[model samples]
Target: KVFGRCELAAAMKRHGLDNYRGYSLGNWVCAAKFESNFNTQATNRNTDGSTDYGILQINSRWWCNDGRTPGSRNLCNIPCSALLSSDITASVNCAKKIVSDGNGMNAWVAWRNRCKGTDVQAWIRGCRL
Candidate 1:
């Protein structure tokens, strides 16, 4: 969605994510970077017959329906393609619900693998929010 460091920080703030769910903006930014490289439309097919959707990479196994995956709960109540949009409102809202339902940002494997307890300040470098 053409969101760089500063722009992403702004968007996150506008979405009320500066310090959401006890996670810092740095955590969110770092997770987004590792999950989708800031691409809103990013998707990844998992070997487990599931797929990850959007910047937060919400999984088809539990979140959204891609119409190709079976047994998706679609807890987000959105089409997986909705997460691929640049608006990010649906994606961000769904991500919040996911985080609340899971162990904070630990629901995102990217956050656990890379951002957990790491120095994530660099993700917001040059951004003032």
Candidate 2:
């Protein structure tokens, strides 16, 4: 993981977060630690039995909308053995959306203030990042 920080930061830049909002990485890292212990391969059977997967805890199939009717399987769940190329940016984009979508990363921020809704590019007040 020598390039972990650099690579992670680069991934963030892909979502227009070139520089961390002072604690974006800290926030995410902390959130991940608390959530799934930073395990990208983590999966757990939610009490509902639907299952959640990965560090972000997003459902691998829900991202694909489940393995319902054969071809109806969402591209997001095309099986790991054939994972063409992991779309790192997609995960980051998902997190960014959650942070910026007005929900305010409450669950995320609750454990880590680093994910608080703040601005890294704002020069004025009340500017949501």
Candidate 3:
């Protein structure tokens, strides 16, 4: 399922992403905007052969198991397929795991390249919150 920008904010907020570990709501908004455009089924292939999956593009190399990535840690202990659904519980839960590490949200290149240190308020501009 695809969510409108503000709709995503509302959903993600319900799932506990707001100011999560010091990253503002816009941080998640901006990452999703660039990572998957709020689509729940987005995927991207990596040069290392592992693929990124779902809304936040969780990487199979470390976060989820696709049963194809050779050295996958499957740290989130979730099937990558679950990340593709409109049900973002797993997506948001796994994202929390990704950010819980010392590296935090910097684990995602999209966040580092686009969301970090930028004014992401625009991504949540019209949300009633």
Candidate 4:
């Protein structure tokens, strides 16, 4: 399901994602715009033949299993299906764990290409923090 940008921002803030882990709320919002456009069930086939799942577009290589993938670290310890749900708690938690790593939001190519070094305030424009 595609959440409205305002709803997404509010939910992200409620989850403590606003400026969490040294990243701005706008950064995460911009990433979601490019990664999944706020669609919870979003998925993409990577050029590497791996898959990216859910709102943050987490990789199957290290985060979750798509079953087709032969090996995964399953670092988030939750099924990729969990990420596709309307409830974003698991996805948000996994995203937090991922950003906690040294790579930060650099782990997400969407953020690197679009959100990085950009003024992303428009992502949360008109939304109260």
Candidate 5:
């Protein structure tokens, strides 16, 4: 499912992602926008043979078990299919797991290139929280 910018931002805040791991609410919103265009079911195949799934594009090799990646750890202990669902609860929870890692939010290259340290208020513009 596709989400409007404010809708996605509000839902993310409801999940307690505001300033999560020192990453701003806007940062998360920005990342999601670039990563999947706010799409819950977005998927991207990587050159490493792993696939990115869901809004934040959690990867198969490290986060979810897609049963396609050669050595998936399923670190989030969730089926990759769960990330494909419209409800983002599980996907957001998995993002926290990934964020807690040594790489933090830097694990997502898209966030690094696009969202990191940038002014992100536009991602949540005009949203009544």
Candidate 6:
């Protein structure tokens, strides 16, 4: 049923990720599950203020850069420097870095516990390699 999730999960596991992305893969998965039910393609259009897109609520019109070549998509391929992280571990890593300085898995968990907030340091203790 969740073939893609498992595949990505396996890839994450191969990379020494016991949770999901960044800190602990499980935390990332937990965030996604709470935010968008693990739907990577999930998007939320703003009825007021700014419109959002994707599971992470990225603003497509603003966050979506229509330049670069990676496979066959343009927006999916963001410039390396533009990301908050210096490592190359795909969107999952990018999100971790951007949100928690390359260590956001457990931070997300902490935030989930504390009611959705940012706690980079705690995440490092539980997620980063």
lDDT of each: 0.88, 0.44, 0.91, 0.89, 0.91, 0.41
lDDT of residue 93 for candidate 5 = 93
Tell me the tens digit of each residue's lDDT in model 4 across 2-120. 98898998888899998888888889889998999999999998877778888899888888877877755789988889999998888899999999988899998989999999988
lDDT of 3 at 20: 93
lDDT of 5 at 50: 95
Model 5 over residues 1-129: C-alpha lDDT tens digits?
A: 999999999899999999888888999999999999999999999999999999999999899898889866889999899998989999999998899898988998999999888898778889997
Tell me the number of clashing residue pairs for each predicted model. Answer: 0, 1, 0, 0, 0, 6
lDDT by residue for model 6 (26-129), tens:
44444544544445545454444333333343433433442331232224346423322222244454454445434344334323564244442332244333
lDDT of 5: 0.91
CA error at residue 1 for candidate 6, angstroms? 11
Candidate 3 per-residue C-alpha lDDT over 1-129 given as tens digits, one digit per residue, 9 for 90 to 100: 998999999999999999998888999989998899889999999999999998899999998999889966899998999999988899999999889999998988889999899898788897899
Task: State, as a TM-score between 0 and 1, how close model 4 is to the true structure.
Answer: 0.95
Ranking by TM-score: 5, 3, 4, 1, 2, 6
lDDT by residue (8-108, candidate 2, tens digit) is 44444455644334344445544555555554555565554454545555543334343433333333544422211245454555555555645444635
Per-residue lDDT of 86 in model 3: 88
List where candidate 4 sits over 4 angstroms from the true fold.
Answer: none
The stretch of ten residues in a row with the least summed lDDT in candidate 5 is 64-73
In the range 1-129, model 1's lDDT, one tens digit per residue, is 757877888898799887888888889999999999999989899998989988889899999988888866899999999998989899899988998985888888889999998988778888777
lDDT score of model 3? 0.91
Model 4: lowest-lDDT 10 consecutive positions: 64-73
